[model samples]
Structure formats: C-alpha cells, structure tokens
Target: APGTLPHFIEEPEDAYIIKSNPIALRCKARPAMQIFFKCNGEWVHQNEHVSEESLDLKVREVFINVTRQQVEDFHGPEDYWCQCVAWSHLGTSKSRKASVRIAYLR
Candidate 1:
C-alpha cells in the first residue's frame, strides 16, 4: 500500500553526529517537494523540486557522496539521522519521515 510518512530516512531517535566536516544530506516523498536534510541541529542542505523517483535516499541524489566529516560536539551517538519534511495538502497523507545511522566509514 502506497502511504506517506517515513519519507526521510533517519536513525534511531532521529539524531546525527554534529560536525563542521562537509557532509551530504537529502530527502524525498511521493508527490515530492523541497527536501531538507538537517544534521544535529543545523541546516545542511535542501533539494527543491524532488521527483517521485527521488523517494529513495538509499541511493542517488548524491552530488559526490558524503565523506567522513568531523563529528560535531553534541549529545546522543556520534551519528546522525536525516528526515524528510514535505509541505503537502493538509487533512490527508501530507507528510513523511525516514532515517539512517550516520556512519563515518562505509
């Protein structure tokens, strides 16, 4: 069944490792929208006009693949969990969220 939510893949508790190191973040949904990847507590990047196929951050949307960035000073695991937030029509399936563990190595 095609449903909304769980759009941006994030880690357990939706947390990420803070760092100044250059990192890459992305998100997607069904109808699509401006996807924003926020790390720790800062804005990392945004992808406007994301497509339906972009629904999977597990692959693609990587301009150059994320490199091992310096972990920032913060709480939680030294990892991160990205989330996808789409502004769609309210009163319906108008949102999504997903996350994954931020790893420094492959």
Candidate 2:
C-alpha cells in the first residue's frame, strides 16, 4: 500500500501522576517520519518532546516528560487525556487515548 498510514507499535499508557514528580509518556510507530504527544486536545510543545529513530527496527519513538506543573496547570472536572500522533509522508495516524489522573495520598 503506497498510501499507508503509520502503525503504532506502542502507545502511551494511563498513569496516576504524583505531585512534584515528572511522568514520562512514550509512543512508538513504524514507518513514520515523526511522532509527537498531545494532551487535553492540545499539542505538547516541541521543546518538551524528544524523538528518536531506529534504523534496524524501522521504528520512530517519541517521549515527553510531563512536568508536575504542566499537569497541575491543566484544570478540569474530568481526568486529563493524552495521546500520540504519528506522521508519515503517506498519511497520519493517532493512537488510543490515555488518561493522566492526579493522585493524592495522605
């Protein structure tokens, strides 16, 4: 298929985020030119994202470290949702949604 969209090998997983600690979200896709992260329907800043390519596996992996401040700043009555979007020359693909919930421990 010449116009094949990028396929996701790994997608970000839901996590309970703790205060003052950063959380890492990872995404991996094959035959992709680039991949990036998004949260709450907004794209994560490129400066906060790190991307790498694997020659042997033909896979592109990207990760974003969501700072505690970043998570805290996003206010909502619902859980914060995130996902990964991968792009190829052919097309683009999006991964399953993942939730980030704030954890409060006494």
Candidate 3:
C-alpha cells in the first residue's frame, strides 16, 4: 500500500514580477501528478500554457516559466496558483495564492 497516493512536497510561491522580465515557479510532488499554474482562478494564457504533466512512476518536479512578453500581456491584479492532481479519485491540491505587482518600465 505504499506510494498508492500522490502528494505535493513543494509548491510555487506568489511573486511580484517586473515587467519584461521572465518568471518561473517550481513544484514537486510524489508519485507524479498533473501540475499546472493558474492566474485569477483561470489557467495562465491557456489551459496548456503553464501546464506540466507527469505520468512516470517517480517523483514529479517541474518548473513552469513565462516569457517577458507573456507576463506583459497578462492582465488583472496578477495572482497565480499551482495545482497538483493525483490523477485518481483523490481530489486536487492547491498551492498558496501568489500575487504579482508588475514594475512597469518607463
């Protein structure tokens, strides 16, 4: 009955990003899971934009990044969240809310 369930050990953090600067977040989970980043309660850019999926029988760790242009195009108050799906009957786990305050360039 070991490794029957999947879980997250490390999750992405809320960030204050500077406009035109690239951004990245790291997430780690055991037993592998489907991981993705979301902003404003919706997937950043698109459903597959910041999604990192794993199907291996090992630990799952991925870093999702956004280009400078991608960040600049993002609207709203700027909040990000990460989710880990066990790909099972188990419910999903959500990371803490990460807020972004873009430092606009002159």
Candidate 4:
C-alpha cells in the first residue's frame, strides 16, 4: 500500500487507434491509495481540482478521438506512454518512476 505498484500494461498496443478506436489504461495498484495517472506531460483528464480514486489520466485513452498529438519534441506523435503518481497531499507527493510504453502493432 505504502510502497507502489510500479507496473503497467505490457502489450504492443496500436497507438494510432487509441484516441478514437478504443483504448483503456488500467492503473492498478496494491493499496490503490488515491493514485493519480498522467500521460505525456499534461493531465490526461480534466478533473484536476478533485481528489478521485485515480490520477489525472487520459479518460479517452484512445488517441484517435483526441485532437492532434501534443507530445514533446523528444518523443514523436506516435511515441506515447503512461505514468502514475501517488500522494497523500500536495506537499507529501510520492510518485512511481516506472512507465508504460505504447506502440503501434504492425
């Protein structure tokens, strides 16, 4: 519970269909302590001011339904991943470094 899950989906998912096709990212945790999810560098979900069971992960998960890809310069549009952060409060911030990489299955 206090430690962390440091885990994610291990599959060669097709990123092209994510936004619109149909995607789902299950941020599972052992304790499930008010964990928050975020992809890329921005908040995936818009509910920022509320404390939910999970983090600001992309509700859409599917990239095809979203607008244009907005990844950093280092990672291309196709290159995207999922990250998680756990915290009891704003000051007491605890996050996991482990991330999940999503790629198109060719």
Candidate 5:
C-alpha cells in the first residue's frame, strides 16, 4: 500500500429523472488511469485516462465521464459503477454502485 492509487474521488449518486435531459456520470482518480463505467454489465465512457507517471505531469486530475443524449437507451432501475485500470498491481479500482430510474413520460 505504499505506492497505490487512492480510491475513487467522485462517485455516482442514485438519481430519478424524466426522459428529457442527458444522464451524466463522472469519476476521478488521485493517480488517474484508464476509466470505465458500466450500466448493468455493459461498458460506457471508454475515453479519457491517465497513467501513474502521467499523473505528476498534469494540471488537472483525469476523470471518466458518461453522457447520453437519450437517457432511455438504457432501462432502469439500472446499476452503475466505475473502474480504473492500471498496468501496475494497482490493477483496477472500482466505485460504489449507484442506481438510476428514468420516469416514463408520454
């Protein structure tokens, strides 16, 4: 535990919203690395990442974010969490589970 990435800084909070605006999820790492978010068991937000050594050379911490134009694309009540990937033994860091429910509007 001497040289290890800290736990997730930003985690998703349960949400309830109408099918209108996009859904946004964000997560950050102290020593940032490859990030991944999942809806149920599917992956989202594959872009954006940082390496251990890369963390020292950055002004802002690298974060993983997920945004969707159609929130209804994924049905609720869905489970979501984040994971950070690294080459070192740090391996992957995971976030707490968050739930989302999109209201059906006619």
Candidate 6:
C-alpha cells in the first residue's frame, strides 16, 4: 500500500533582492524523502540547497539562495519565480510558487 504524499507546512514567499544580494527561498514539508528547489522552471543544483530533517516531527525543511545573477538571467523578462518539490514513497508534492524581484531605489 502506498503511503501519504508529502504536504507543505511552510511555503516560499515573495521577496526583494537588493543590489547584487542573494535572496533565500524556504520550504517545509512532512513525510518527504527528498526536497529540492527550482528557479524559473529550472532545477536548482542539489549542492546549492541546505536541507534539514527533523526526526521528532518527521519534517523536512530546505532553503536555497538565489543570486542576483540568477534573477537577471531568468527566462521571464520581469519577476523571477521559484518553487519547491517534495518526493515521498507515495508521490510528489509541490509548494506554492513564489516570486523574486530586484529592489531599486530611483
């Protein structure tokens, strides 16, 4: 019998990146074996993500930083987007999409 799919406890939120600074995206889920992040529909490298597993709560939390260069190079002309996906024994679950934009003082 298949187990329950992972569910999100905390989803990434929209943020603003200041001049060349990096922005962090966070995701927290339960019953997940693996969690990873994506930027502009492209997979963020595993090495770039910081993952934490809680034995007590059986929750997985992951954070990925997006550099200014990545935002500038995103496929969309305006507003870069990112999302987190979690995989469990049963199936995969995705978190809500979040947007990252540059902050300018003009």
Which has the greatest TM-score?
Answer: 6
What local distance difference test score does each model get?
A: 0.36, 0.84, 0.56, 0.38, 0.48, 0.86
Cα misplacement distance, residue 66 of candidate 2 (Å): 1.3
> Over 4 Å off in model 3, which ranges?
1-5, 44-57, 77-86, 104-106
lDDT of 5 at 5: 55
The residue-by-residue lDDT of candidate 2 on 1-106, one tens digit each, is 5567888888899877676677888899988988988788888899988888887536899988876677778888777888899998877899999887778889
Which segments of model 6 are wrong by more than 4 Å? 75-78
| Residues 14-87 of candidate 4: C-alpha lDDT, one tens digit per residue | 33333324344333332334545566666557353233243443111212122223332336464565555533
* Cα lDDT tens digits for candidate 3, 1-106: 5335556778666554575666777677666555556655556443344445556575666666655555556665534334433343353556665544456656
Q: Write the per-residue lDDT of candidate 1 for residues 1-106, one digit (tens) a residue.
A: 3434333332213334334244444443443334344445565554422333344322222221233343433456545444434443331122223333444434
Ranking by TM-score: 6, 2, 3, 5, 4, 1
Q: For model 1, state the Cα shift of residue 7 in Å.
A: 6.1
| lDDT over C-alpha atoms for residue 4 of model 2 | 72
Candidate 2: give the clashing pairs: none
For 54-101, candidate 5 gives per-residue lDDT tens digits of 344221234443434334465555443333332234566566766655
In order of appearance, the predictions have TM-scores of 0.37, 0.87, 0.59, 0.38, 0.57, 0.88
Better of 4 and 6 by lDDT: 6
Candidate 2 wrong stretches, greater than 4 Å: none
Encode model 6's per-residue lDDT on 1-106: one tens digit a residue: 3567888989999989888888888899998889999777788899999999997537899999888887776666657888899998778999888998888967
